[PDB]
RNA sequence: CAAUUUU
RNA sequence: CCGCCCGUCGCUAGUACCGAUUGAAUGGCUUAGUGAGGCCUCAGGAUCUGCUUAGAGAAGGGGGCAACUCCAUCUCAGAGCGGAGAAUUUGGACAAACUUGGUCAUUUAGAGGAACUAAAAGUCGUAACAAGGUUUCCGUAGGUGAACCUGCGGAAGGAUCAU
RNA sequence: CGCGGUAAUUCCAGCUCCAAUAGCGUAUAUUAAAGUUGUUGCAGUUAAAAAGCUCGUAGUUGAACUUUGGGCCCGGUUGGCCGGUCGGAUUUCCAACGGGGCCUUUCCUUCUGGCUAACCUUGAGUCCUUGUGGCUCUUGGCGAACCAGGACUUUUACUUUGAAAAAAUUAGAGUGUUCAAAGCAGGCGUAUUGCUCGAAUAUAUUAGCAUGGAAUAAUAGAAUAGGAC
RNA sequence: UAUCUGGUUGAUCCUGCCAGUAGUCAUAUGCUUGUCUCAAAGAUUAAGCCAUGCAUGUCUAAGUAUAAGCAAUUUAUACAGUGAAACUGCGAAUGGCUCAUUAAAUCAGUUAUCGUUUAUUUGAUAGUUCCUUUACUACAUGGUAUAACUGUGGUAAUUCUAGAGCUAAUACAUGCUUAAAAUCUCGACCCUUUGGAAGAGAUGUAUUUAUUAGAUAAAAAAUCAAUGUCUUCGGACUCUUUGAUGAUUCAUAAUAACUUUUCGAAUCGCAUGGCCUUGUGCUGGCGAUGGUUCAUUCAAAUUUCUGCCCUAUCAACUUUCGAUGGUAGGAUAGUGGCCUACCAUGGUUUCAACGGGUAACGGGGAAUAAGGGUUCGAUUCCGGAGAGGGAGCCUGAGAAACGGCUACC
RNA sequence: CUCUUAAGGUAGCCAAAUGCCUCGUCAUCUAAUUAGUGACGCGCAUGAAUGGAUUAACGAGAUUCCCACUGUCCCUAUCUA
């Protein structure tokens, strides 16, 4: 029932706009969904024109990718730690974009050891041939291996949770996990 | 508002249908067209305004519901249906066969042709597109789309559809030395064959054009349409021949119909 | 509903009620032709108005002009088709200088009296 | 109007759908996505070596100059990344066979690859409706004024 | 030096 | 010039304006409240309908010599784990409606007050038009039955274009 | 404006006459008449109107000057001396110009290419009227005579042209709707398969768009030279 | 078809008004009325109230026929022609009325979607579905559980309808069956190391994320390394692929994963034919129906520029109830202060912003006329709005619908 | 114009704390109003430094009405010292 055009909302001077022509259907905007955790109640809706979108509630698992290899494996989603705009969804466990989450980190080192074999971090007929081939890049980065030391990883988040259901982000890689920790710790 | 219009009055229709003003009532409007806006014409108004093979309304449906008139082969079960530019409608055999090409003035046509040369269209690309599966097609302008054209040449050029399937049989390049045929506007359907390859680059397109008798008339791109080559033309035309014989020449040329 | 249908006036009264000669110069004409009503003497002047409405504006424009050599050659023909302009003065300037109340003596009240038959125009 | 640690606020400004691989190190390190918009509008080079993001820049953001091209001179500069242009035009009323000159001063989005004082005879394009009222973006500054780096009295 | 009215 | 004409005062019909009432109503915008409904949403789980393990409240009967109860044996299911789910309820958002005031805008009621208009033109005077009998007009001040008068400083539209 | 106070050319009536005509009067707004709202086009001594004078930013209004001339060269429009008659063609040139391109210091952008091209390129070859005089394979070569990219350009005001200004509305061309206001019909034979022209055209401001024009105006480009080349 | 005349005075000239004068496709009234074609008509004030009726329903060759309906009777003992009532399907969002609100709002002209949705019309368009990949059995075809109906109720009510007996599908939820190659993931055998493969899995389409390509102004040696075909065996050379825009992270293909799994005929009509291996063998035409996507069309929604009557006895207006911008989030079909969190303090304006009034819906146009203009347009066409006054909302491709629903007045 | 002792209440204001007749008359206030307020003046007997008229603030000054509050009251009851 929330309108979203500007036949209300006083214009660039200050003129109290003549508001009229009773509100219509091509004008709509719905209640914010506030997706949560708690095992998959993603409730389907109709939309305009003959359409069908996905407003999630209580999701727990979504494929999070690296992606310079493109792994995209399903991971257990655990807890939001920092949202860049709204400091209430960190405390009410809602998630949208850049509400970057700790997850589980375990379905990655089953894949990581599967052809690298570091191991981190304290034989088939071509086992060395499938390990010497994609070798000489066994180091990843200092601050990324040292998060597998605790064994739970910070994923970023990219898909829109309450408009397509799935929260489908990426492994927060690069120096961006040397960026959010400055915005993480400095809440003072 | 609240949805599409579906009723259309007289004295609100296009005037180039040359439709009547004073019957006291509404007008034909087409369905969802294949090709154009109502710069097409319904095939209702073709056979009681210009052909006069009927004389009142639903007797157009009486011929139409009984397999008589073939349009591009198919009977075209919708009684009002757009018969736009270039299209071939055909009746029974022995020379009842037509084609829909503009004259000079603004009427559409009465263009009696044979069953031969009515075995192929001559279209125009609006857009080329390489759609799904990585496989290219093209979009000709009568609503159709044809698959695997004679490839890697053009946008904005003619094509020769062949009334069986897709069938690129002759694409003819957008040349200076050419026979072009402008479709629409105040300069609708004369002929001006070319003069020059303008683009007016960046913003918007326009093409300078000269006629047979050296009256340069200059048109928009969206009106202009290639149809042949100098002296050649593929689709033949009626007795008007595209001159725009003006009124101070209309005065004494019409002095030959009295017989006295 | 229905598309509109036009209807016009066909005369134009003078802006003067009472002049002591034109209310008799009409009757120097009214007995001269046997006309029943001065609506008609306004009606034939309405053409003599609108002919010279149509003729002065074709002449303030130039020689060799794409309406004057079409319509100024065409307007003279339709009124010599009746024959009220003479068969020598086709140059559209004796159309502006057309005779006063000259259209109405080729009304066939007095085109049937010139073939005898009445011994009046009141009989016409 | 900001610089000096471009990622100054609490969200991380970086271009969508671009990425630099953390594996092998080279000298360029950020494949920035730039382009040209057409109508003979050739980009300034300060767009390249600069490291701003600001999603509604015309050469880097996901917009394109689409409609018409206007002109005018700039009045204000006191906002974060927006300025207002000034226009002068003459409306003719046929009752008097005379003119009169009006004005309308629309706002227009600015790109940090440029730089503008007040003055600055400038030309703008048309964009997607990027904000509340500002719908145009400056596309070529043509910085032209008298007494520029010239006063020494 | 001082002077009012004439339906 | 026995010309005209000015004001008060009286006689009659009018028209606006001011007006105590904490005037009144209508419309709009806002102070703080109450807030029906519908939608979303945290819940709830009457009420149905299935499948499976298989007893029982019973035979479904592989035809066995008595078997295993193969089966479902009406429905308690001993269970499971569903699935559709109302009556109500939970927290948002939109919010009709109403009060409360303040502020505007539009119309109206008023006891009464002073103005002006029109007017058989009456009473009191003569102000003006002539040097109108004190030259007339303007600004300001004072006075008085009423025109009017007196100062004061101008101007001639004056009764002088003149030492 | 005035008539009527027992002589009414106005009242009330008769007879006559006059207007307009199946229409006429009355009332109310509004247009012209209104040069009584005035841009084209007003007055400013009591007449109605010039501030008591002066300063003053907007708003208007703003002196003059920069490619003129001169010559060359081409084809167009109108009309001729030309009808020469079957009021139709101009064989030659002329008359008044208007359109375009050169030269006088005076180009009318520049570079990348592919073209293209004129060949003054010309190695040379061809019926004849004498080997770019009528023709051919090819080079330093009469290149934005055509595309698509560059140096990318002081900016406008103004003005011609042009697709653009829905249909009806208006001026209208054509048509024997009986004429007409209308409407877009109709017309011609063979009236026995039988033909056929039709339904235009036009202003339609300003705002946009394209192109031609460079007078009239504004507008910027060098001065401690950081000036183009 | 550019015109003037009576009134101040004893008579004159002149401003100035009053009056006369013609027209109104502009209203009313009065008197009067014989004929032909063309017809405006409860706009004005009361967007004030309404008795009564009518104004939106629909079926083919093609969705279901147990009507104890109607004819039938000979091609149909599965009906075999229709066809009430009905369930599906579509439409009822169009048309029609009126002009109250509404003065940069609507609207007129001109643009944009590289910022979006689309039932319908027309054209392109599906061998990759199994998850114990021979137990997954119907693919020679599986299950509803409800109608209409049949019979019994209440209430006076109305287009209210109850438990019970059955029942269909293009309604519902399911569920399979068809050609080979190609690469990738593993690894039975390598035990040799310059290599091969049994077998197993995916392989269509949609979804959403992250990533890759989608190139194109001249040339040449040297460097180090993976480094090849052939072998004159030092040696020649790997021929290198590109659609469009003025412009894109564009179309498109690819990598890696998902999905309460998106789709991939369990549908009807007519004619009955072709190989003999005479068997429900195998193979076929022509016609509707619905689908996913890309187009088109009918649209809709936004948005650029410029244009609207009077008033200063309205000069400052708008922001703690977003006013002006930015970074993020949501929400939107779709861009955006649309909404939120925060950060900054803007924006408009004597060229008339803000405010007030309209006996203002805007435009196409009307009347009148020498030219310039004035005053109108409720309304025959285009667009907008409302259905007593405000709000909500289901279905639907399309509605804040009102001859649809709910609440309040 | 006149009389009494000389002059005859001008500006203003009022049933006012000054009006006997009087609970004057009109309006508004109220359900009802000898109260209150605003007007009328021929005022027994107001009225000009015996000062007249209007006043912002300040009244433990005197009055009337409204809102909030409440055992003053309907209707009394209970407890403590």
JSON list of N, CA and C in Angstrom, two decimals, chain B residues 15 19 22 24 27 30 38 50 54 77 86 93 99 114 142 154 171 176 227 258 260:
[
{"chain": "B", "resi": 15, "resn": "UNK", "atom": "N", "xyz": [-6.54, 8.93, -42.21]},
{"chain": "B", "resi": 15, "resn": "UNK", "atom": "CA", "xyz": [-7.23, 9.42, -43.40]},
{"chain": "B", "resi": 15, "resn": "UNK", "atom": "C", "xyz": [-6.74, 8.76, -44.67]},
{"chain": "B", "resi": 19, "resn": "UNK", "atom": "N", "xyz": [-11.36, 6.57, -45.87]},
{"chain": "B", "resi": 19, "resn": "UNK", "atom": "CA", "xyz": [-12.57, 5.99, -45.31]},
{"chain": "B", "resi": 19, "resn": "UNK", "atom": "C", "xyz": [-13.63, 7.08, -45.17]},
{"chain": "B", "resi": 22, "resn": "UNK", "atom": "N", "xyz": [-19.30, 10.11, -42.77]},
{"chain": "B", "resi": 22, "resn": "UNK", "atom": "CA", "xyz": [-20.61, 10.51, -42.28]},
{"chain": "B", "resi": 22, "resn": "UNK", "atom": "C", "xyz": [-21.60, 9.36, -42.12]},
{"chain": "B", "resi": 24, "resn": "UNK", "atom": "N", "xyz": [-22.16, 7.81, -39.49]},
{"chain": "B", "resi": 24, "resn": "UNK", "atom": "CA", "xyz": [-22.84, 8.04, -38.22]},
{"chain": "B", "resi": 24, "resn": "UNK", "atom": "C", "xyz": [-22.44, 7.08, -37.12]},
{"chain": "B", "resi": 27, "resn": "UNK", "atom": "N", "xyz": [-15.54, 2.93, -36.50]},
{"chain": "B", "resi": 27, "resn": "UNK", "atom": "CA", "xyz": [-14.70, 2.60, -37.65]},
{"chain": "B", "resi": 27, "resn": "UNK", "atom": "C", "xyz": [-14.09, 1.21, -37.49]},
{"chain": "B", "resi": 30, "resn": "UNK", "atom": "N", "xyz": [-7.85, -2.56, -36.70]},
{"chain": "B", "resi": 30, "resn": "UNK", "atom": "CA", "xyz": [-7.29, -3.91, -36.84]},
{"chain": "B", "resi": 30, "resn": "UNK", "atom": "C", "xyz": [-7.07, -4.59, -35.50]},
{"chain": "B", "resi": 38, "resn": "UNK", "atom": "N", "xyz": [-1.64, 1.45, -37.93]},
{"chain": "B", "resi": 38, "resn": "UNK", "atom": "CA", "xyz": [-2.76, 1.51, -38.86]},
{"chain": "B", "resi": 38, "resn": "UNK", "atom": "C", "xyz": [-2.45, 2.36, -40.08]},
{"chain": "B", "resi": 50, "resn": "UNK", "atom": "N", "xyz": [-12.34, -0.28, -52.02]},
{"chain": "B", "resi": 50, "resn": "UNK", "atom": "CA", "xyz": [-11.56, -0.24, -53.24]},
{"chain": "B", "resi": 50, "resn": "UNK", "atom": "C", "xyz": [-11.91, -1.35, -54.22]},
{"chain": "B", "resi": 54, "resn": "UNK", "atom": "N", "xyz": [-17.95, -6.54, -52.18]},
{"chain": "B", "resi": 54, "resn": "UNK", "atom": "CA", "xyz": [-19.07, -6.67, -51.26]},
{"chain": "B", "resi": 54, "resn": "UNK", "atom": "C", "xyz": [-19.64, -5.28, -51.02]},
{"chain": "B", "resi": 77, "resn": "UNK", "atom": "N", "xyz": [-8.11, -16.22, -40.76]},
{"chain": "B", "resi": 77, "resn": "UNK", "atom": "CA", "xyz": [-9.40, -16.40, -40.08]},
{"chain": "B", "resi": 77, "resn": "UNK", "atom": "C", "xyz": [-9.88, -15.15, -39.33]},
{"chain": "B", "resi": 86, "resn": "UNK", "atom": "N", "xyz": [3.56, -4.01, -49.04]},
{"chain": "B", "resi": 86, "resn": "UNK", "atom": "CA", "xyz": [4.25, -4.99, -49.88]},
{"chain": "B", "resi": 86, "resn": "UNK", "atom": "C", "xyz": [3.55, -6.35, -49.91]},
{"chain": "B", "resi": 93, "resn": "UNK", "atom": "N", "xyz": [-8.19, -18.34, -58.55]},
{"chain": "B", "resi": 93, "resn": "UNK", "atom": "CA", "xyz": [-7.25, -18.28, -59.66]},
{"chain": "B", "resi": 93, "resn": "UNK", "atom": "C", "xyz": [-7.81, -17.40, -60.78]},
{"chain": "B", "resi": 99, "resn": "UNK", "atom": "N", "xyz": [-1.19, -7.17, -54.63]},
{"chain": "B", "resi": 99, "resn": "UNK", "atom": "CA", "xyz": [0.00, -6.79, -53.88]},
{"chain": "B", "resi": 99, "resn": "UNK", "atom": "C", "xyz": [-0.21, -5.36, -53.41]},
{"chain": "B", "resi": 114, "resn": "UNK", "atom": "N", "xyz": [-0.58, -11.25, -61.27]},
{"chain": "B", "resi": 114, "resn": "UNK", "atom": "CA", "xyz": [-0.73, -12.67, -61.54]},
{"chain": "B", "resi": 114, "resn": "UNK", "atom": "C", "xyz": [-0.30, -13.51, -60.35]},
{"chain": "B", "resi": 142, "resn": "UNK", "atom": "N", "xyz": [7.94, -7.38, -41.71]},
{"chain": "B", "resi": 142, "resn": "UNK", "atom": "CA", "xyz": [6.52, -7.73, -41.73]},
{"chain": "B", "resi": 142, "resn": "UNK", "atom": "C", "xyz": [6.10, -8.57, -40.53]},
{"chain": "B", "resi": 154, "resn": "UNK", "atom": "N", "xyz": [25.22, -6.99, -43.27]},
{"chain": "B", "resi": 154, "resn": "UNK", "atom": "CA", "xyz": [24.44, -5.76, -43.28]},
{"chain": "B", "resi": 154, "resn": "UNK", "atom": "C", "xyz": [23.64, -5.59, -41.99]},
{"chain": "B", "resi": 171, "resn": "UNK", "atom": "N", "xyz": [19.60, -10.80, -51.21]},
{"chain": "B", "resi": 171, "resn": "UNK", "atom": "CA", "xyz": [19.74, -9.51, -50.57]},
{"chain": "B", "resi": 171, "resn": "UNK", "atom": "C", "xyz": [20.46, -8.58, -51.53]},
{"chain": "B", "resi": 176, "resn": "UNK", "atom": "N", "xyz": [24.36, 3.57, -53.52]},
{"chain": "B", "resi": 176, "resn": "UNK", "atom": "CA", "xyz": [24.15, 4.79, -54.29]},
{"chain": "B", "resi": 176, "resn": "UNK", "atom": "C", "xyz": [24.28, 4.38, -55.75]},
{"chain": "B", "resi": 227, "resn": "UNK", "atom": "N", "xyz": [13.99, -0.96, -52.80]},
{"chain": "B", "resi": 227, "resn": "UNK", "atom": "CA", "xyz": [13.13, -1.94, -53.45]},
{"chain": "B", "resi": 227, "resn": "UNK", "atom": "C", "xyz": [13.74, -2.52, -54.72]},
{"chain": "B", "resi": 258, "resn": "UNK", "atom": "N", "xyz": [-12.41, 13.36, -71.69]},
{"chain": "B", "resi": 258, "resn": "UNK", "atom": "CA", "xyz": [-13.75, 13.78, -72.11]},
{"chain": "B", "resi": 258, "resn": "UNK", "atom": "C", "xyz": [-14.15, 13.13, -73.42]},
{"chain": "B", "resi": 260, "resn": "UNK", "atom": "N", "xyz": [-14.33, 14.37, -76.28]},
{"chain": "B", "resi": 260, "resn": "UNK", "atom": "CA", "xyz": [-14.93, 15.32, -77.22]},
{"chain": "B", "resi": 260, "resn": "UNK", "atom": "C", "xyz": [-13.88, 15.94, -78.13]}
]
